[PDB]
Design a protein around this ligand. Structure first.
Ligand SMILES: [Mg+2]
Lengths: 98, 50, 252, 252, 36, 75, 49, 50, 369, 59, 49
DNA sequence: CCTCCATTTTTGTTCGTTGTATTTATTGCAATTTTCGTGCCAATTTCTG
DNA sequence: CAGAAATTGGCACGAAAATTGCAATAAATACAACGAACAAAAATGGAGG
């Protein structure tokens, strides 16, 4: 099984799972630990943002790759915004600043 | 037909496969003798004796 | 969005998460506060000039006797409004100074630790901009709809999810309580409605932590907001620390 | 038909990341240069399996593509399999031969008391190889070979010395892949797994990283070739039972 | 500088975890005897 | 540079600074339109940068000097 | 009829037959399970069972 | 307005340095909201719209 | 006994549902026509203004792939006063060549010309078809072939080849991107003939599992239990009354439906008119004739000279039957229709007949020959 | 018992950590690896190390 | 299964760590060829329109 | 006989890795909007001179 | 090709009919199976003065 781009989840905006759904491979905590141990910061930032759930970054990365310019402009993952909304639904004021 | 690594036998201790290989060789040899007799048509007495 | 609650309701996280912050701040044991919140016993908010003092936990018969003896010379309440009144009137700097004096006067080990912890809680509350009465809910936030979608079925029909069920129960209880209160019903009914509203809000915020988990059609507990937040299937461990990615494959 | 030429053009020097689960240490992910093949299975270098804890009886691997230039350079400089020959837990090599390679290297570096071609005098390793390939000398025959070896100087330069060594045909044959700077006593014995690991570690400590990769690949090739040539098998007569077993059991 | 050594140490300790399970003095060799 | 990066690491000293320097030079050659200082032999820019660093023709100081010179020339 | 249909079609111990070969079917039909309704659970079972 | 700036505003990413957590006043909760929910009814099945 | 099915589609699931905890529903994303169009817009070397114009243009494309607002609307929606209309036209021309070709066209002639502009010049009957589409596209709609032949100055065979080439194109290019899946409806009440008379019965696809959680609260749900029973009772009674009053619609099809209203059923079932209007909406019944909404059986009426009333649906069916068998050489005008229905006792007007014909989507008499 | 409540709520006991942090009005400075992994930034180690110092000089 | 003629020996690293080396004559004779069958369904329904 | 310390009891939090779903409850008024048939006239096309 | 009939439909008219918000609405026997470590807090016993 292989995948370059496909359909995403509606709430988390992340790739789905399974071969029958043309899903992606999971990059769990232990793979993150391995990348941290190597010291590959840019590979990890690619895994976390422009390949899973940074939407504008997803589109701009695809356009840049087709354009012949291998460079990313990362943003904020959608799941963190979902987390902020879910925490604020508990009556707790959590926010970014400065 | 097939080549298998001999290094997988001694550490796993499944010695049944080696004995099965030997006995299968013996059975195929019996079959080969019968086939050789059948091809050069010989009398039924020799076939049933063997 | 938001929901306007007809009556104040305590936040279960700040009450039933050990050590209890409400109890530690009011220096009252947890069980007494739980009894008062769930409409079982009375607490005296103002001692007035009678024998009643602060935080004394009356009962129903004791309250009736107090009413017939001392009359209208005191103030005693039950429910979340009583705890809100206790928290609102209480001061912080003076309590800090008195606790410091008591700590530096008497000599012990257990009570010294208790007073140190209470002093730390009070100082933390003063340093932050928070006010203690914010630990009682009066307005309730409502999650955006696209983060709690309905479940489509065959034939072009939808089924409600768990968060929607909990929100519906809260809204129904709130509407019934508002109608009863405007209709001037007897107290023995409005108090029951208030208790059921408190239970519904507690179930919505953290289902199963207090009492028993409310189940659905599948005889299984519903998913509250805390369930979304925490666990091995929560956002942190399932989405924010690891995730599925594009440009990947697998094979033998 | 042209998209395959395009595909060969784009993957030319673009690394990929291979990962096998569970990832227990950082050597569970490694970077490789792809070679396009037919079929549906991923081919893996034999020397890295120990790092992955992988074997070819049904395992699967995931493959990821780095996109930007920084990621590609990190794959080439930090994660590539040629940068990961030493363990990070201890200082020992991890990319080391095993099984068939070890069996072949052990078999070729052995001596037999009365073997064909024993007692000859050879002008060097090439004559030993020429004799072996012609059938004129056994791989285990004890001979005398003129060996030239180099040693590093105080200022860091190699000086040569040549002498007649008592060895066997197979050890002189194996000496042709050992890089300059290592002593001949490193192969003048029957090699096992520990001896080969020691030889790789000595090569790394004396000569650096670049010769060590070449040495490891040559060792793998030679071990495979001679393990194939030996014809080593397993039979039922190989498990020899001692004759004293019956008496010992009876006495017990 | 910048190496993440805590993760390396934790992985080094944790990786081999699955291999683990779940009236008199007689001198042995020649040498002087020391007391402290 | 095609197999090992040992010479480049020795030239730059740190394996973490080498990635940054090589990425900067490769981005110059891939998008900025600069020409390689070594004979290109059907190599990618990521490998051309490392081969330039091996020969000692490129490091951070040289890149900064060339950037200042180019900016002053364009001014 | 609803109860009988539910038991035969959606119980824990009612399963699609294993049908790779005759041996799979024979093995499936002679199988004993400690799980199911009125039995143990995969996690809170024990170690001596 | 201008459509170019309108479209460019919706891809802008916030820049921050720290995360701050605290209790929420009733005024803060009201300031988050865009309206109040009064009915427990989700979808009108007789017209298929909220 | 309820009929047991003699055939069926074996269920898709082939698992043992062993896991006792499964996550919450989230859903997936879908690629519609506009998603594909925007994906193509991003990967095109536009400019900032060009990309804004393209965004505004793609916003206006409908399901069939046709532009739904004039270019002046788009130019106004841009919101910048330096931009003229020719830039919008150029961006629209560039967009119209995206896959599928012909999308975002102003009208049919434009789409057909766009599709013909892509064929190589060596296609045999290209100029003739181009001329037909460009100049005379309504003479083809009238199936004339003689005045068109008198204007195009061509023989028969060339015209036939050109028409065949024209009709091989795609009039709705944007329907290729199929993001939708055919959705269906589940009948709630089934009508079957028992003892020669039609009787109704509720569908058994619902959930009748009456259960309570006595392990531990359920008092509120006890009221919902009987609320469901009330819903079932009212639905069954209303449907039964409808079927009892309409015993002749099922037997002989249309042309026999009675002119009933909400008040009749309200009087029959002893409920308010509003309740009848609520129950008989978006609820369906299945009959050997098809699936019909309960609202389908309520209709208007017209005076009958014999002293009765005739439903409007019956008159629509009679109009359909009469028009279907008109004279092919010279069709029937509505003046003729009002005369034919007059002799039968149906006293309707002429404009009413025209309205009925319009509702049935039937071309006038001159267009039916 | 670390200075970051994000890095502590990610690990265990989310309810207790979040309650204490909300009561105390804590502020998180995003200095560890886990915090930057959560928000999808560059970790302050390896090739990202030289990046973070730059920001720490402009703050 | 099938009866295969087998030898136990190392062959140039192609049976390294539980790998199997197979002759081309095995493939030519279709000794391990299998048949797989699949079912699909189209349902013509009735709807409102 | 009181405080206070130690001890047993009570409650809470954690534990290797995928699976495919069934929700809506009504009911009686007063107001509002929607729709009905049918007339009027104006533009169309159609046949005849 | 010109001169009006025959046709069709947009627009409008009163009048019947379909569609909405908004307060009022009840409670009847069964329901399940078995986990282990470990820590922090609470309830009680008991002893020094
Ligand atoms: Mg394996």
């Amino acid at each position: 099984h292989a995948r370059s781009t496909g359909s995403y989840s509606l709430v988390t905006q992340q790739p789905l799972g399974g071969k029958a759904q043309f899903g992606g491979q999971r990059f769990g905590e232990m793979e993150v630990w391995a990348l941290e141990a190597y010291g590959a910061a840019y590979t990890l930032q690619e895994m976390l943002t422009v390949k899973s759930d940074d939407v504008n970054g997803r589109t701009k990365m695809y356009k840049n790759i087709v354009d012949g310019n291998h460079q990313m402009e990362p943003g904020m993952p959608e799941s963190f915004n979902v987390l902020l909304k879910e925490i604020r639904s508990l009556g707790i004021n959590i926010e970014l600043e400065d | 037909d097939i080549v298998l690594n001999p290094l997988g036998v001694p550490s796993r201790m499944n010695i049944g496969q080696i004995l099965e290989t030997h006995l299968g060789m013996a059975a195929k040899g019996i079959g080969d003798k019968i086939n050789a007799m059948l091809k050069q048509q010989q009398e039924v007495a020799k076939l049933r004796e063997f | 969005g938001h929901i306007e609650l007809a009556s104040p309701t305590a936040h279960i996280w700040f009450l039933k998460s050990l050590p209890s912050r409400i109890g530690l701040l009011l220096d009252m044991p947890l069980r007494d506060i739980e009894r008062v919140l769930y409409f079982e016993s009375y607490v005296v908010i103002e001692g007035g000039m009678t024998n009643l003092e602060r935080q004394q936990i009356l009962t129903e018969e004791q309250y009736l006797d107090a009413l017939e003896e001392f009359g209208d010379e005191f103030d005693a309440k039950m429910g979340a409004e009583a705890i809100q009144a206790l928290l609102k009137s209480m001061d912080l700097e003076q309590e800090c100074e008195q606790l410091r004096e008591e700590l530096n006067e008497t000599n012990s080990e257990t009570k010294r630790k208790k007073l140190t912890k209470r002093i730390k809680l009070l100082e933390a509350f003063v340093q932050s901009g928070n006010k203690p009465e914010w630990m009682i809910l009066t307005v309730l936030p409502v999650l955006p709809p696209d983060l709690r979608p309905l479940v489509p079925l065959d034939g072009g029909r939808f089924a409600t999810s768990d968060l929607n069920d909990l929100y519906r129960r809260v809204i129904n209880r709130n509407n019934r309580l508002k109608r009863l209160l405007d209709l001037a019903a007897p107290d023995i009914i409005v108090r029951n409605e208030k208790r059921m509203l408190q239970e519904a809000v507690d179930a919505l915020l953290d289902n199963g932590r207090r009492g028993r988990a409310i189940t659905g059609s599948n005889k299984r507990p519903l998913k509250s907001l805390a369930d979304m937040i925490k666990g091995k299937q929560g956002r942190f461990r399932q989405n924010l620390l690891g995730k599925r990615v594009d440009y990947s494959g697998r094979s033998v | 038909a042209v998209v395959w030429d395009i595909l060969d053009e784009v993957i030319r020097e673009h690394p990929v990341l291979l990962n096998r689960a569970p990832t227990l240490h950082r050597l569970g992910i490694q970077a490789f240069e792809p070679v396009l093949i037919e079929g549906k299975a991923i081919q893996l270098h034999p020397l890295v399996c120990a790092a992955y804890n992988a074997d070819f009886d049904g395992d699967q691997m995931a493959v990821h593509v780095p996109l930007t230039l920084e990621a590609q350079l990190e794959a080439r400089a930090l994660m590539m399999s040629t940068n990961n020959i030493l363990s990070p837990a201890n200082g020992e090599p991890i990319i080391v031969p095993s099984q068939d390679v070890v069996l072949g290297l052990y078999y070729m570096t052995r001596d037999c008391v009365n073997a064909k071609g024993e007692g000859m005098v050879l002008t060097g390793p090439k004559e030993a190889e020429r004799l072996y390939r012609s059938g004129l000398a056994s791989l285990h025959a004890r001979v005398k070979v003129r060996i030239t070896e180099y040693e590093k100087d105080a200022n860091g330069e190699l000086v040569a010395k040549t002498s007649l060594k008592d060895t066997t045909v197979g050890r002189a044959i194996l000496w042709m892949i050992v890089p300059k700077g290592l002593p001949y006593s490193i192969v003048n014995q029957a090699l096992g797994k520990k001896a080969i690991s020691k030889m790789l570690n000595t090569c790394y400590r004396i000569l650096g990283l670049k010769p060590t990769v070449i040495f490891a690949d040559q060792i793998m090739y030679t071990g495979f070739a001679y393990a194939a040539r030996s014809g080593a098998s397993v039979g039922i007569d190989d498990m020899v039972i001692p004759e004293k077993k019956h008496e010992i059991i009876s006495e017990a | 500088k910048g190496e993440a050594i805590g993760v390396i140490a934790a992985q080094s300790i944790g990786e081999p975890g699955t291999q683990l399970t779940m009236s008199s003095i007689q001198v042995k060799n020649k040498g002087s005897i020391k007391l402290s | 540079a095609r197999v090992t990066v040992q010479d480049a690491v020795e030239k730059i000293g740190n394996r973490f600074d080498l990635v940054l320097v090589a990425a900067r030079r490769a981005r110059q050659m891939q998008v900025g339109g600069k020409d390689p200082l070594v004979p290109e032999e059907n190599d990618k820019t990521t490998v051309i940068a490392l081969r330039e660093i091996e020969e000692g023709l490129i490091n951070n100081q040289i890149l900064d000097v060339r950037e200042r010179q180019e900016q002053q020339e364009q001014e | 009829s609803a109860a009988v249909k539910e038991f035969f079609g959606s119980s824990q111990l009612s399963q699609f037959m294993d049908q790779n070969n005759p041996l799979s079917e024979i093995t499936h039909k002679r199988r004993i399970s400690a799980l199911g309704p009125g039995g143990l659970t995969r996690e809170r079972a024990g170690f001596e069972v | 307005k201008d459509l170019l700036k309108f479209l460019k505003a919706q891809t802008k990413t916030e820049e921050f340095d720290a995360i701050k957590i605290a209790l929420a006043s009733p005024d803060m909760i009201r300031s988050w909201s865009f309206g109040e929910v009064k009915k427990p009814e989700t979808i009108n099945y007789r017209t298929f719209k909220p | 006994w309820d009929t047991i099915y003699t055939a069926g589609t074996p269920s898709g699931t082939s698992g043992d549902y062993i896991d006792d905890e499964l996550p919450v529903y989230q859903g997936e994303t879908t690629q519609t026509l506009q998603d594909y169009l925007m994906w193509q817009v991003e990967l095109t070397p536009f400019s900032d203004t060009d990309r804004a114009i393209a965004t505004s243009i793609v916003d206006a494309v409908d399901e069939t792939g046709y532009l739904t607002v004039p270019l002046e609307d788009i130019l106004e929606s841009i919101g910048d006063e330096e931009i003229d209309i020719d830039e919008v036209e150029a961006v629209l021309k560039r967009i119209q060549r995206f896959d599928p070709v012909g999308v975002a066209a102003k009208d049919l002639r434009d789409c057909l010309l766009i599709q013909l502009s892509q064929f190589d010049k060596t296609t045999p009957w290209l100029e003739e078809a181009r001329l037909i589409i460009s100049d005379h596209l309504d003479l083809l709609a009238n199936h004339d072939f003689r005045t068109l032949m008198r204007v195009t100055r061509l023989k028969e065979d060339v015209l036939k080849e050109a028409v065949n080439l024209i009709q091989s194109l795609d009039p709705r290019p944007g329907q290729s991107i199929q993001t939708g899946e055919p959705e269906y409806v589940i009948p709630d009440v089934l009508v079957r003939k028992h003892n020669g008379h039609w009787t109704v019965e509720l569908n058994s696809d619902s959930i009748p599992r009456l259960q309570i959680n006595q392990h531990y609260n359920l008092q509120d749900a006890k009221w919902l239990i009987k609320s469901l029973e009330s819903r079932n009772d009212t639905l069954l009674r209303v449907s039964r009354c409808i079927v009892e009053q309409q015993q002749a619609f099922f037997e002989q099809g249309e042309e026999y439906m009675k002119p009933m209203v909400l008040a009749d059923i309200a009087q029959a079932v002893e409920m308010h008119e509003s309740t009848i209007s609520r129950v008989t909406t978006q609820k369906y019944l299945h009959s050997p004739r098809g699936i019909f909404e309960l609202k389908y059986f309520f209709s208007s009426h017209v005076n009958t000279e014999g002293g009765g009333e005739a439903s409007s649906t019956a008159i629509r069916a009679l109009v359909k039957k009469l028009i279907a068998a008109e004279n092919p050489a010279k069709p029937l005008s509505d003046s003729k229709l009002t005369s034919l229905l007059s002799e039968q006792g149906i006293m309707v007007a002429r404009r009413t007949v025209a309205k009925y014909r319009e509702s049935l989507s039937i071309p006038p008499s001159n267009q039916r020959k | 018992a670390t200075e970051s409540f994000i890095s502590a709520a990610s690990f265990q006991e989310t309810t207790r950590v979040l309650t204490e942090a909300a009561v105390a009005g804590k502020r998180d400075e995003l200095r560890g690896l886990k915090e930057n992994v959560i928000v999808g930034r560059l970790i302050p180690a390896g090739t990202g190390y030289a990046y973070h110092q730059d920001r720490m000089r402009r703050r | 299964g099938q009866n295969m003629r087998v030898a136990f020996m190392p062959w140039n690293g192609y049976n390294f760590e539980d790998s199997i080396l197979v002759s081309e004559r095995v493939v030519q004779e279709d000794r391990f060829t299998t048949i797989h069958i699949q079912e699909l369904a189209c349902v013509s329904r009735d709807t409102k329109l």
